[PDB]
Structure formats: C-alpha cells, structure tokens
Write a protein that binds this DNA or RNA. Structure first.
Length: 457
RNA sequence: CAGGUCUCUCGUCGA
RNA sequence: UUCGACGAGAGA
C-alpha cells in the first residue's frame, strides 16, 4: 500500500475530522505495585516524549506496492481457497437494510455507541440519531444513503492505547480508519451472509479463527493442524498489502458466486480516500482497518497469501494437504512435511510482504497465536492452555479508563493469568492484595479456575 | 460532548 | 443451559 496524493481539505472540499488529543488512560490503583514500561500512545505531534516527526512516523507504514495483478500462482492459490470455501454454501444474496442495520443471529447489529464517520461526525449526527433499536427504522438510513452516497472517505484517528516505550519516542502509534455509516451498511448488505458464515465457523474450512474461544479452541488446534507446524507474523500487514491480494480476494468472491456488482466493492477498499484532520489523502493498496469485514477479509487474503507462497517457493506442493487458520495477519498452519519459513518469507518479499517469526522450527511448545502460547496441562496433556505472559498482564493492570472498572478489569486478567500455573497466579493475586483496593476485590482461587476450565470438556 | 470494524471472555440489570 | 440491554478486559 502507498499514499498516492495528499491535499488540502480547502482543495478537496472535505469537512475536517479532528479527534481528541488527550488519553482516557490514567495510572490505576496498581500502577505503583507492578512494574511496566508501556505508556498511552502519542496522540499529537506536540507530545514531549516524541523523538521523531510524528506524521511521517504515522504514515511510514505505507511501504509502497509491488504486484498489482495476479500471476498464475496467486490465481491457483485463490481458486484452491475459493474451492475449499464452497462446502460452506455461502449465501451470496443481499441482506436487507434492516438486517444490515439491526442484526441477525450471526451478524451483530451496527454498533450504536461509536462514531457515524464522515461526514456525520463533522455535522454532529450520531448513529443513534439515525438508527433506532426499538423502531428498527431504516427510512432515515436510506435517506442519508441517498443524500451522501457511497464510497465516502475514511476518518483517520490515532488509537488511544498502550504502546511499548520504544514506540513512544518513535511516534509509532497506530491508525484507525473510521468507516462511514453509509459504507458499513452497504458492505454489510452485500456481504452480511459471508460474515455470518465466517462467524459461525472458526476452523480450517474458512481458514479463519474469528469466533474462536482460546480457552477451548487451543485443545482443538492440534487436531485441526496435523503434521508439521509453521507460522509467522507480518510487519504492518494491512499497509503492506499490494493490490494483487485485493484482486485475488475478488477471484475468491467471484468463484463462490458473487455477482460483479458485489465483487467490485473490493476495489472500493483497495483504493480509498481518507481524511486526517484538515487534509485529505488517497491510498492504493492496503486494508483500511476500520472498514466493514476487515478482520474477515484480512484472514481470507491471508489464506490466499500462504497458498500463493507455498506453490511458488517449492515444487510438488499439494495445497489440499495444507491446514491453516488465520486471524488477520496471525497465522498457524500445518503440512505433512516441514516447511522452510526463511524461504517462504523471502518469496513474501517479492510480493511486498515483510514476514517475521531466525527461522526456528515451530512446535506447540514455542508457537503463539493471538499472543498466547500453548502449554499442555500436566494432569491431562490432551488439553491445552492458552498462555499469556505475565509481563503483558502486569502492563495491563497499571492503567485504567475508570476506577469503577477495577473489579471487571482485574477479574478479566485473573482469567488470563492462571493458565501460567498456580505459582505465578498466587504471586499475582498476592501483589494485588498488597493495596487496600486490591483487598476489597473478589478474586477466584486457582483450583476453582482450573476446575471450571477442566469442566468445559 | 468526540476516538473504527470485529471476536471471545467476564461482570451488572432482565427474561 | 439459553436469550436481551449495558459496562469491562484481552485479542485481531
């Protein structure tokens, strides 16, 4: 992905989208008793902690484009993935606007607690001023889709969140491309049922982990991915995607029977306009993260990428012998034979992909997925714990958006940490008990946590 | 008053 | 066990 041009809003006529510059994160009741080095991200170029120029850092991720267009390897990869998807019988029909707006069983209603995007926010219209969970009315929605059309620009904002200390001085905050309500509605209408299918089917048919629950999914993976394991992460996945991957995504959607009217929306996300503050810019390539279907499309593309890199790098691959699941850029995969990932990553560079783990042999003992390790339980080794490092839980507990959430916050971290074992857990709970606010919390005991988890099977 | 698309899990109030 | 509204945490 590559920024094509960037121009004044006075020159493009776009209303300006200016978000808040101050963080909602503040030191928690446990800032003092736990060690950590993450801080809230830089949100303005004025930030004292900055050691670089902000806006060049913010946009440095768009590292250009390479292939615009499938070679035969991309093409066979896309069709193998698309053929796999056929067993799901995805309904390529349009969703009503009412379903796109207000939800179904496997499609959540549009989130009424977040911005309505360009132009509404600059105009002071909120989603809840257009959509209504009780009436379930869509005439106000249709009116505004008529008034402002489709293919509106994405409102860029900096994500308020913790980052590593390295990424503070280097202005390496992450961007949110807020979707306009109009585009959310239209991409939900045309792809709602695909979303429904992917949400109801985490696994190795969709090749997607969206909708999994690591507590029980981790024990399912060694069955789902038999044979030898490989994996990697990517440097700046969404911004590194060249248009060829969006043209492959269109082949896949075509093969499962979408009409061209639907398939060509994908070009409307491979080619995008964004409004950051007072200036407009335009990107070719690259997934706009806040867009509808972004996690699903990124995972589909990832299935295309892996297959493409398999058959271009080695002779005599049988794609039908590949198992994989992706969650965005995160990949876990298996093949009857060990796969040289250093070689794969190299091929990935020929397509603009910067892929990252030396190339250690991937084992269940060292693999990670969704930032969790894998650790067979001692009593029952056919049941696998998702392990989250204690450093990350320590970093989390030192901050708060509202002291009213301490119990929920600390409870949620307890359910993540215990998988690291009784010793590490009791040390965690004990530090929490070392401040008065810690002593007031309801904290489960490891044995209860372990028994509850054991009973899930 | 603002700051995306989502998943899971937990909690609070109901059925 | 299941379903709705709201809040939270982690992950993508």
């Amino acid at each position: 992905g590559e920024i094509q041009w960037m121009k004044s809003n006075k020159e493009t006529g776009r209303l300006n989208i200016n978000g808040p510059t101050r963080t909602k994160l503040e030191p928690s009741a446990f800032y003092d008793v736990f060690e950590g080095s993450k801080k809230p991200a830089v949100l303005t170029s004025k930030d004292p902690r900055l050691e670089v120029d902000f806006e060049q850092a913010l946009f440095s991720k768009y590292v250009g484009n390479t292939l615009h267009e499938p070679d035969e390897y991309v093409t066979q990869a896309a069709l193998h993935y698309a053929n796999q998807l056929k067993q799901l019988d995805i309904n390529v029909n349009k969703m009503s606007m009412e379903e796109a707006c207000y939800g179904t069983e496997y499609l959540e209603a549009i989130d009424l607690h977040t911005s309505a995007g360009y132009p509404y926010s600059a105009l002071g219209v909120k989603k809840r001023d257009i959509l209504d969970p009780i009436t379930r009315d869509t005439t106000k929605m249709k009116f505004y889709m008529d008034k402002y059309g489709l293919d509106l620009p994405y409102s860029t904002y900096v994500k308020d969140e913790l980052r590593s200390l390295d990424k503070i001085r280097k202005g390496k905050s992450r961007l949110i491309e807020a979707s306009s309500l109009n585009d959310s509605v239209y991409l939900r209408m045309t792809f709602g049922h695909l979303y429904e299918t992917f949400h109801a089917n985490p696994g190795t048919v969709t090749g997607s982990a969206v909708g999994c629950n690591p507590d029980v999914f981790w024990s399912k993976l060694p069955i789902l991915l038999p044979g030898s394991l490989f994996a990697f992460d990517y440097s700046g996945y969404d911004a590194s995607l060249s248009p060829v991957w969006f043209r492959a995504l269109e082949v896949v959607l075509r093969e499962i029977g979408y009409p061209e009217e639907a398939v060509s929306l994908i070009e409307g996300i491979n080619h995008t306009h964004h409004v950051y503050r007072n200036r407009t810019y335009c990107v070719l390539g690259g997934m706009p993260s806040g867009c509808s279907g972004t996690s699903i499309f990124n995972s589909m593309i990832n299935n295309i990428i892996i297959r493409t890199l398999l058959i271009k790098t080695f002779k005599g691959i049988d794609l039908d012998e590949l198992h994989m699941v992706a969650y965005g850029d995160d990949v876990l995969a298996s093949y009857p034979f060990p796969i040289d990932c250093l070689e794969l990553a190299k091929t990935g560079k020929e397509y603009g992909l910067t892929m990252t783990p030396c190339f250690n042999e991937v084992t269940w003992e060292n693999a990670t997925f969704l930032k969790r390790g894998f650790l067979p339980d001692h009593q029952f080794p056919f049941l696998i714990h998702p392990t989250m490092p204690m450093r990350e839980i320590h970093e989390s507990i030192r901050w708060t958006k509202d002291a009213r959430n301490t119990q929920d916050h600390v409870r949620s971290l307890c359910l993540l940490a215990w998988h690291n074992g009784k010793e590490e857990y009791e040390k965690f709970v004990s530090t929490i008990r070392s401040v008065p606010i810690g002593r007031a919390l309801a904290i489960p005991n490891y044995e209860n946590l372990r028994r509850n988890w054991l009973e899930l099977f």
